[PDB]
Amino acid sequence: EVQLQQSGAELVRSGASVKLSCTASGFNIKDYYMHWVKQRPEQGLEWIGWIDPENADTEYAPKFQGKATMTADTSSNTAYLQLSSLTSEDTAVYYCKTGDYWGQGTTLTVSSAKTTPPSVYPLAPGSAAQTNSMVTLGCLVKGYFPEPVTVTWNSGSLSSGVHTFPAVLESDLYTLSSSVTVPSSTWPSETVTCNVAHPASSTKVDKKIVPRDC
Amino acid sequence: DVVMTQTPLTLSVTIGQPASISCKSSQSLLDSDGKTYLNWLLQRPGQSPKRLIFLVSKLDSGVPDRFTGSGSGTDFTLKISRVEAEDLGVYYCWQKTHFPQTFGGGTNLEIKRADAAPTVSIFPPSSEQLTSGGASVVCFLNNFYPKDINVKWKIDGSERQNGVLNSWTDQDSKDSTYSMSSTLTLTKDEYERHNSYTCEATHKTSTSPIVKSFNRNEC
């Protein structure tokens, strides 16, 4: 049963180092080269280097020479990738691979931000405003760090008609929004509340949407 | 480095119909050893990449014969004779001839469906936010198809680019539409120096833009 098991997600501060691991089972790492690959959403896949665990020989892509150090502990069938002098440009998923087998990836987040709970703001439609058979409401979840937040509507009871958007980074902090579309027959007689948990800050906020009744 | 450019960026597919994806390299991938080290990967959402083709045309174990690869030099093609559901995801070409090995930017295969206009909703800043000294105006553009959409903000009738943050969902698993959020953030002071705020969307479903607006001095 060939399996490359990578270490868990890490969140670190700019300037730090990390040492990612990749443990093989079902074969001997001394028999084949092990590679590492970086993936970011915008910039895509980039090959970092390989190590030959049989003799500890390495080759790095020039751009990673200053940054990456590959090693292997053959007695524990594990390869390691040390990444140093980290910056936000190192925030990525890192994969190990050998032969035609890829590991599951490790997410690395690098930031200088301080832990910050989101500011959660209601996006309230007009009451008098009668928008076809359906009404869209929302919540803005602004300026938090780190990921993730967990957004629910009506304590999780309302999942139909929800769009919770991917977070985007604003000046080192994250922002996202969530919309929910409900039957106009039900609103505002049935209340709608967003719930936004941010475990990293020991917070969970509720914002009841109150109709803008001008 | 060798640059690997994929065409198209997105291919809209129909189950049972063929698909073709192109990869152009900036330099020949013919190795001095006579082999051409060009691979294809598929990555399904939230999953690790998996190789389907190596050495231009060789299929990996378990890959169905609906897939074929061809190419030489700087030009490569992946073909799927008939698309199946399990084929959807992002395909990358991948060259190893030239050190360092490099990857294309990816081609997304997405499901074609009937055009659908966005449902557009606009929201002023909350009073809670306005106490912060910041002011965000939020526009949702929901459940539209195809994914190509242009969103523009106007303040007092003049187009505004600075301070906009956009985010997009992936294709919905149930209705095959896309959604988008656009947020314009101003200082409270700048927000209170203007009256009219507009989110405008141009989408192929209509020749004229969808305009959603509020005025601070109106309902």
Side-chain angles (χ1 to χ4, degrees):
Chain A
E1 175 53 57
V2 175
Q3 177 189 239
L4 298 174
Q5 279 296 346
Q6 292 189 245
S7 50
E10 292 204 48
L11 172 63
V12 301
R13 293 202 56 91
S14 303
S17 292
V18 297
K19 191 174 189 180
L20 311 183
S21 68
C22 172
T23 302
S25 53
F27 75 95
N28 188 336
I29 67 165
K30 290 198 189 182
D31 292 348
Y32 311 94
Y33 293 12
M34 307 187 71
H35 294 69
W36 296 86
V37 179
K38 184 179 176 178
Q39 186 171 32
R40 292 184 281 174
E42 187 184 357
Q43 292 90 356
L45 291 152
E46 295 185 284
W47 177 81
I48 300 169
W50 58 250
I51 183 162
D52 178 350
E54 204 297 324
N55 63 188
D57 189 35
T58 59
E59 187 171 35
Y60 300 89
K63 73 181 303 300
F64 289 104
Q65 193 64 59
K67 171 62 57 180
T69 306
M70 294 170 296
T71 60
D73 179 359
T74 62
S75 67
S76 71
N77 227 30
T78 300
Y80 299 100
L81 175 69
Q82 185 180 0
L83 301 166
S84 57
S85 193
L86 290 166
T87 76
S88 64
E89 297 288 4
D90 300 312
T91 295
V93 175
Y94 292 84
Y95 294 103
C96 66
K97 70 164 201 80
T98 188
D100 110 300
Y101 291 87
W102 295 62
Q104 85 273 197
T106 297
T107 301
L108 178 63
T109 304
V110 183
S111 175
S112 69
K114 30 53 219 60
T115 303
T116 303
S119 300
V120 181
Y121 304 120
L123 304 176
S127 59
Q130 233 313 118
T131 312
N132 48 261
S133 65
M134 301 290 285
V135 179
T136 297
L137 309 93
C139 281
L140 175 59
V141 177
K142 189 163 189 304
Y144 64 94
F145 181 85
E147 293 190 301
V149 293
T150 302
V151 179
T152 57
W153 290 89
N154 288 359
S155 297
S157 64
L158 187 56
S159 56
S160 299
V162 173
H163 296 295
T164 297
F165 293 89
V168 304
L169 198 65
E170 50 166 50
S171 296
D172 289 349
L173 300 176
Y174 295 94
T175 298
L176 68 68
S177 51
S178 181
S179 67
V180 63
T181 299
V182 300
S184 53
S185 76
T186 73
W187 193 84
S189 59
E190 296 296 304
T191 64
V192 181
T193 304
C194 67
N195 330 103
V196 181
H198 190 238
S201 62
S202 319
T203 59
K204 181 173 189 181
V205 164
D206 306 308
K207 297 292 166 177
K208 190 183 64 216
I209 312 306
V210 176
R212 283 184 293 116
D213 175 38
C214 69
Chain B
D1 297 347
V2 175
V3 172
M4 300 295 280
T5 301
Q6 297 181 228
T7 299
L9 180 61
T10 302
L11 189 68
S12 305
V13 295
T14 295
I15 299 175
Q17 294 296 106
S20 186
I21 298 176
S22 306
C23 175
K24 175 70 155 172
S25 63
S26 60
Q27 189 168 354
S28 175
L29 302 188
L30 175 62
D31 191 300
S32 70
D33 73 358
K35 298 169 181 192
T36 299
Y37 297 95
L38 190 279
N39 295 340
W40 292 94
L41 296 164
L42 168 63
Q43 186 170 41
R44 304 189 176 82
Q47 305 189 18
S48 294
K50 304 176 162 36
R51 195 182 71 194
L52 59 140
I53 298 289
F54 63 99
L55 289 175
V56 181
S57 65
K58 299 194 182 176
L59 269 60
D60 278 293
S61 164
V63 175
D65 71 352
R66 297 175 300 104
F67 289 84
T68 59
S70 62
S72 69
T74 61
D75 306 294
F76 303 83
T77 306
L78 180 65
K79 295 182 179 307
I80 315 177
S81 60
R82 58 189 103 75
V83 174
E84 292 188 3
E86 52 259 45
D87 300 339
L88 302 173
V90 180
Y91 287 84
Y92 300 94
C93 53
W94 171 17
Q95 76 82 22
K96 310 197 322 158
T97 294
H98 285 286
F99 182 89
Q101 68 191 266
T102 55
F103 300 85
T107 293
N108 187 41
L109 298 201
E110 62 107 58
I111 289 181
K112 190 168 187 195
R113 59 151 287 155
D115 289 355
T119 301
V120 187
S121 303
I122 190 169
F123 302 82
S126 69
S127 65
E128 288 86 345
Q129 188 177 197
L130 287 175
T131 64
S132 84
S136 296
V137 191
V138 178
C139 192
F140 299 115
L141 309 93
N142 286 344
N143 301 90
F144 59 86
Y145 187 91
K147 69 191 293 177
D148 278 358
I149 192 167
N150 173 72
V151 70
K152 290 174 169 172
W153 286 95
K154 300 179 170 177
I155 303 166
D156 288 343
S158 69
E159 173 171 32
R160 169 62 165 235
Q161 275 183 300
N162 294 316
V164 177
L165 200 52
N166 293 332
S167 184
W168 301 261
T169 60
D170 290 353
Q171 187 171 42
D172 189 77
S173 68
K174 288 192 288 193
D175 74 6
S176 302
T177 65
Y178 293 90
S179 299
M180 174 181 186
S181 178
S182 186
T183 302
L184 168 67
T185 298
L186 309 197
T187 60
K188 177 211 180 203
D189 288 347
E190 180 175 45
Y191 177 71
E192 292 186 348
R193 293 181 87 249
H194 304 278
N195 188 54
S196 181
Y197 290 86
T198 294
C199 176
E200 300 198 349
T202 294
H203 185 260
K204 71 168 291 180
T205 42
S206 65
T207 62
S208 68
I210 299 165
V211 170
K212 296 291 173 198
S213 305
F214 65 90
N215 280 9
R216 290 173 51 241
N217 67 7
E218 293 186 348
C219 187

PDB file of all heavy atoms in Angstrom, chain B residues 99-119:
ATOM      1  N   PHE B  99      16.040  21.768 -17.523  1.00  0.00           N
ATOM      2  CA  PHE B  99      16.140  22.102 -16.114  1.00  0.00           C
ATOM      3  C   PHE B  99      16.031  23.620 -15.938  1.00  0.00           C
ATOM      4  O   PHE B  99      16.700  24.375 -16.656  1.00  0.00           O
ATOM      5  CB  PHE B  99      17.531  21.649 -15.664  1.00  0.00           C
ATOM      6  CG  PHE B  99      17.745  21.896 -14.180  1.00  0.00           C
ATOM      7  CD1 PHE B  99      17.397  20.944 -13.230  1.00  0.00           C
ATOM      8  CD2 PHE B  99      18.278  23.095 -13.748  1.00  0.00           C
ATOM      9  CE1 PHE B  99      17.573  21.200 -11.886  1.00  0.00           C
ATOM     10  CE2 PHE B  99      18.447  23.336 -12.395  1.00  0.00           C
ATOM     11  CZ  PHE B  99      18.057  22.391 -11.484  1.00  0.00           C
ATOM     12  N   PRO B 100      15.236  24.154 -14.981  1.00  0.00           N
ATOM     13  CA  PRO B 100      14.334  23.366 -14.129  1.00  0.00           C
ATOM     14  C   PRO B 100      13.034  23.016 -14.842  1.00  0.00           C
ATOM     15  O   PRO B 100      12.518  23.819 -15.603  1.00  0.00           O
ATOM     16  CB  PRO B 100      14.055  24.325 -12.960  1.00  0.00           C
ATOM     17  CG  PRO B 100      14.111  25.690 -13.609  1.00  0.00           C
ATOM     18  CD  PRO B 100      15.246  25.574 -14.604  1.00  0.00           C
ATOM     19  N   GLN B 101      12.479  21.882 -14.470  1.00  0.00           N
ATOM     20  CA  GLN B 101      11.170  21.508 -14.982  1.00  0.00           C
ATOM     21  C   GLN B 101      10.142  22.566 -14.596  1.00  0.00           C
ATOM     22  O   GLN B 101      10.221  23.181 -13.524  1.00  0.00           O
ATOM     23  CB  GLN B 101      10.812  20.129 -14.442  1.00  0.00           C
ATOM     24  CG  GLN B 101      10.556  20.044 -12.949  1.00  0.00           C
ATOM     25  CD  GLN B 101      10.472  18.610 -12.500  1.00  0.00           C
ATOM     26  OE1 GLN B 101       9.389  18.008 -12.412  1.00  0.00           O
ATOM     27  NE2 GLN B 101      11.640  18.003 -12.320  1.00  0.00           N
ATOM     28  N   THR B 102       9.130  22.749 -15.445  1.00  0.00           N
ATOM     29  CA  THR B 102       8.142  23.806 -15.303  1.00  0.00           C
ATOM     30  C   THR B 102       6.771  23.284 -15.731  1.00  0.00           C
ATOM     31  O   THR B 102       6.673  22.275 -16.429  1.00  0.00           O
ATOM     32  CB  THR B 102       8.530  25.074 -16.079  1.00  0.00           C
ATOM     33  OG1 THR B 102       8.753  24.733 -17.458  1.00  0.00           O
ATOM     34  CG2 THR B 102       9.770  25.732 -15.490  1.00  0.00           C
ATOM     35  N   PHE B 103       5.760  23.993 -15.251  1.00  0.00           N
ATOM     36  CA  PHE B 103       4.352  23.643 -15.420  1.00  0.00           C
ATOM     37  C   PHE B 103       3.610  24.766 -16.119  1.00  0.00           C
ATOM     38  O   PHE B 103       3.909  25.945 -15.955  1.00  0.00           O
ATOM     39  CB  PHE B 103       3.668  23.446 -14.066  1.00  0.00           C
ATOM     40  CG  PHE B 103       4.291  22.335 -13.226  1.00  0.00           C
ATOM     41  CD1 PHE B 103       5.407  22.608 -12.424  1.00  0.00           C
ATOM     42  CD2 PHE B 103       3.745  21.069 -13.148  1.00  0.00           C
ATOM     43  CE1 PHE B 103       5.953  21.599 -11.664  1.00  0.00           C
ATOM     44  CE2 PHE B 103       4.313  20.063 -12.406  1.00  0.00           C
ATOM     45  CZ  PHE B 103       5.395  20.350 -11.612  1.00  0.00           C
ATOM     46  N   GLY B 104       2.626  24.365 -16.949  1.00  0.00           N
ATOM     47  CA  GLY B 104       1.696  25.318 -17.537  1.00  0.00           C
ATOM     48  C   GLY B 104       0.786  25.905 -16.466  1.00  0.00           C
ATOM     49  O   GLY B 104       0.747  25.403 -15.342  1.00  0.00           O
ATOM     50  N   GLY B 105       0.033  26.940 -16.847  1.00  0.00           N
ATOM     51  CA  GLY B 105      -0.859  27.614 -15.940  1.00  0.00           C
ATOM     52  C   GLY B 105      -2.182  26.921 -15.691  1.00  0.00           C
ATOM     53  O   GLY B 105      -2.934  27.384 -14.840  1.00  0.00           O
ATOM     54  N   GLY B 106      -2.512  25.881 -16.470  1.00  0.00           N
ATOM     55  CA  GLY B 106      -3.720  25.102 -16.248  1.00  0.00           C
ATOM     56  C   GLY B 106      -4.846  25.504 -17.202  1.00  0.00           C
ATOM     57  O   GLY B 106      -5.000  26.665 -17.585  1.00  0.00           O
ATOM     58  N   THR B 107      -5.680  24.504 -17.488  1.00  0.00           N
ATOM     59  CA  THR B 107      -6.905  24.668 -18.254  1.00  0.00           C
ATOM     60  C   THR B 107      -7.994  24.033 -17.415  1.00  0.00           C
ATOM     61  O   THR B 107      -7.888  22.833 -17.082  1.00  0.00           O
ATOM     62  CB  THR B 107      -6.809  23.976 -19.611  1.00  0.00           C
ATOM     63  OG1 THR B 107      -5.843  24.632 -20.422  1.00  0.00           O
ATOM     64  CG2 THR B 107      -8.157  23.999 -20.285  1.00  0.00           C
ATOM     65  N   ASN B 108      -9.034  24.815 -17.101  1.00  0.00           N
ATOM     66  CA  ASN B 108     -10.135  24.296 -16.305  1.00  0.00           C
ATOM     67  C   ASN B 108     -11.156  23.704 -17.266  1.00  0.00           C
ATOM     68  O   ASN B 108     -11.572  24.393 -18.180  1.00  0.00           O
ATOM     69  CB  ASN B 108     -10.787  25.369 -15.452  1.00  0.00           C
ATOM     70  CG  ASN B 108     -11.809  24.753 -14.529  1.00  0.00           C
ATOM     71  OD1 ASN B 108     -11.570  23.672 -13.956  1.00  0.00           O
ATOM     72  ND2 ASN B 108     -12.954  25.401 -14.398  1.00  0.00           N
ATOM     73  N   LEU B 109     -11.605  22.481 -16.990  1.00  0.00           N
ATOM     74  CA  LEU B 109     -12.791  21.957 -17.666  1.00  0.00           C
ATOM     75  C   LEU B 109     -14.005  22.208 -16.787  1.00  0.00           C
ATOM     76  O   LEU B 109     -14.045  21.698 -15.667  1.00  0.00           O
ATOM     77  CB  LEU B 109     -12.772  20.458 -17.938  1.00  0.00           C
ATOM     78  CG  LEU B 109     -11.689  19.922 -18.854  1.00  0.00           C
ATOM     79  CD1 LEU B 109     -12.196  18.576 -19.356  1.00  0.00           C
ATOM     80  CD2 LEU B 109     -11.269  20.838 -19.977  1.00  0.00           C
ATOM     81  N   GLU B 110     -15.014  22.907 -17.323  1.00  0.00           N
ATOM     82  CA  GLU B 110     -16.228  23.204 -16.592  1.00  0.00           C
ATOM     83  C   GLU B 110     -17.410  22.774 -17.452  1.00  0.00           C
ATOM     84  O   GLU B 110     -17.301  22.635 -18.667  1.00  0.00           O
ATOM     85  CB  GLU B 110     -16.318  24.681 -16.208  1.00  0.00           C
ATOM     86  CG  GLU B 110     -16.369  25.675 -17.360  1.00  0.00           C
ATOM     87  CD  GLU B 110     -17.678  26.359 -17.672  1.00  0.00           C
ATOM     88  OE1 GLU B 110     -18.203  27.015 -16.763  1.00  0.00           O
ATOM     89  OE2 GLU B 110     -18.170  26.286 -18.820  1.00  0.00           O
ATOM     90  N   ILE B 111     -18.543  22.585 -16.806  1.00  0.00           N
ATOM     91  CA  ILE B 111     -19.779  22.113 -17.420  1.00  0.00           C
ATOM     92  C   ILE B 111     -20.482  23.251 -18.142  1.00  0.00           C
ATOM     93  O   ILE B 111     -20.773  24.281 -17.528  1.00  0.00           O
ATOM     94  CB  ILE B 111     -20.724  21.551 -16.340  1.00  0.00           C
ATOM     95  CG1 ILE B 111     -20.202  20.236 -15.785  1.00  0.00           C
ATOM     96  CG2 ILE B 111     -22.157  21.410 -16.863  1.00  0.00           C
ATOM     97  CD1 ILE B 111     -21.092  19.619 -14.724  1.00  0.00           C
ATOM     98  N   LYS B 112     -20.807  23.065 -19.424  1.00  0.00           N
ATOM     99  CA  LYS B 112     -21.658  23.997 -20.139  1.00  0.00           C
ATOM    100  C   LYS B 112     -23.116  23.825 -19.697  1.00  0.00           C
ATOM    101  O   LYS B 112     -23.613  22.711 -19.538  1.00  0.00           O
ATOM    102  CB  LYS B 112     -21.505  23.737 -21.638  1.00  0.00           C
ATOM    103  CG  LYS B 112     -22.150  24.785 -22.555  1.00  0.00           C
ATOM    104  CD  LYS B 112     -21.694  24.584 -23.991  1.00  0.00           C
ATOM    105  CE  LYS B 112     -22.131  25.638 -24.956  1.00  0.00           C
ATOM    106  NZ  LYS B 112     -21.960  25.225 -26.354  1.00  0.00           N
ATOM    107  N   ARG B 113     -23.793  24.955 -19.491  1.00  0.00           N
ATOM    108  CA  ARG B 113     -25.220  24.990 -19.243  1.00  0.00           C
ATOM    109  C   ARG B 113     -25.756  26.226 -19.953  1.00  0.00           C
ATOM    110  O   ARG B 113     -24.982  27.037 -20.471  1.00  0.00           O
ATOM    111  CB  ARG B 113     -25.532  24.974 -17.743  1.00  0.00           C
ATOM    112  CG  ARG B 113     -24.895  26.149 -17.012  1.00  0.00           C
ATOM    113  CD  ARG B 113     -25.680  26.584 -15.776  1.00  0.00           C
ATOM    114  NE  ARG B 113     -26.890  27.262 -16.244  1.00  0.00           N
ATOM    115  CZ  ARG B 113     -28.006  27.382 -15.587  1.00  0.00           C
ATOM    116  NH1 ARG B 113     -28.143  26.787 -14.424  1.00  0.00           N
ATOM    117  NH2 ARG B 113     -28.988  28.104 -16.096  1.00  0.00           N
ATOM    118  N   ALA B 114     -27.073  26.384 -19.878  1.00  0.00           N
ATOM    119  CA  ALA B 114     -27.756  27.518 -20.468  1.00  0.00           C
ATOM    120  C   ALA B 114     -27.345  28.806 -19.759  1.00  0.00           C
ATOM    121  O   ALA B 114     -27.124  28.834 -18.544  1.00  0.00           O
ATOM    122  CB  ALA B 114     -29.238  27.297 -20.358  1.00  0.00           C
ATOM    123  N   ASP B 115     -27.198  29.869 -20.549  1.00  0.00           N
ATOM    124  CA  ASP B 115     -26.872  31.179 -20.022  1.00  0.00           C
ATOM    125  C   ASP B 115     -27.894  31.561 -18.957  1.00  0.00           C
ATOM    126  O   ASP B 115     -29.086  31.260 -19.064  1.00  0.00           O
ATOM    127  CB  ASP B 115     -26.850  32.223 -21.133  1.00  0.00           C
ATOM    128  CG  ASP B 115     -25.694  32.132 -22.118  1.00  0.00           C
ATOM    129  OD1 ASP B 115     -24.794  31.287 -21.910  1.00  0.00           O
ATOM    130  OD2 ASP B 115     -25.703  32.921 -23.087  1.00  0.00           O
ATOM    131  N   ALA B 116     -27.377  32.197 -17.909  1.00  0.00           N
ATOM    132  CA  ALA B 116     -28.176  32.686 -16.811  1.00  0.00           C
ATOM    133  C   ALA B 116     -27.654  34.053 -16.390  1.00  0.00           C
ATOM    134  O   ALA B 116     -26.468  34.231 -16.093  1.00  0.00           O
ATOM    135  CB  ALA B 116     -28.149  31.709 -15.647  1.00  0.00           C
ATOM    136  N   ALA B 117     -28.569  35.016 -16.317  1.00  0.00           N
ATOM    137  CA  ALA B 117     -28.215  36.350 -15.866  1.00  0.00           C
ATOM    138  C   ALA B 117     -27.953  36.330 -14.359  1.00  0.00           C
ATOM    139  O   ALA B 117     -28.640  35.650 -13.618  1.00  0.00           O
ATOM    140  CB  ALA B 117     -29.339  37.318 -16.186  1.00  0.00           C
ATOM    141  N   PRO B 118     -27.014  37.156 -13.870  1.00  0.00           N
ATOM    142  CA  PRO B 118     -26.795  37.306 -12.433  1.00  0.00           C
ATOM    143  C   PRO B 118     -27.959  37.997 -11.736  1.00  0.00           C
ATOM    144  O   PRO B 118     -28.577  38.910 -12.292  1.00  0.00           O
ATOM    145  CB  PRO B 118     -25.543  38.174 -12.342  1.00  0.00           C
ATOM    146  CG  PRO B 118     -25.603  38.998 -13.592  1.00  0.00           C
ATOM    147  CD  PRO B 118     -26.151  38.050 -14.646  1.00  0.00           C
ATOM    148  N   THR B 119     -28.200  37.558 -10.499  1.00  0.00           N
ATOM    149  CA  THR B 119     -29.008  38.301  -9.554  1.00  0.00           C
ATOM    150  C   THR B 119     -28.087  39.246  -8.786  1.00  0.00           C
ATOM    151  O   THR B 119     -27.179  38.773  -8.092  1.00  0.00           O
ATOM    152  CB  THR B 119     -29.724  37.344  -8.611  1.00  0.00           C
ATOM    153  OG1 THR B 119     -30.544  36.485  -9.407  1.00  0.00           O
ATOM    154  CG2 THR B 119     -30.546  38.145  -7.622  1.00  0.00           C
TER     155      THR B 119
END
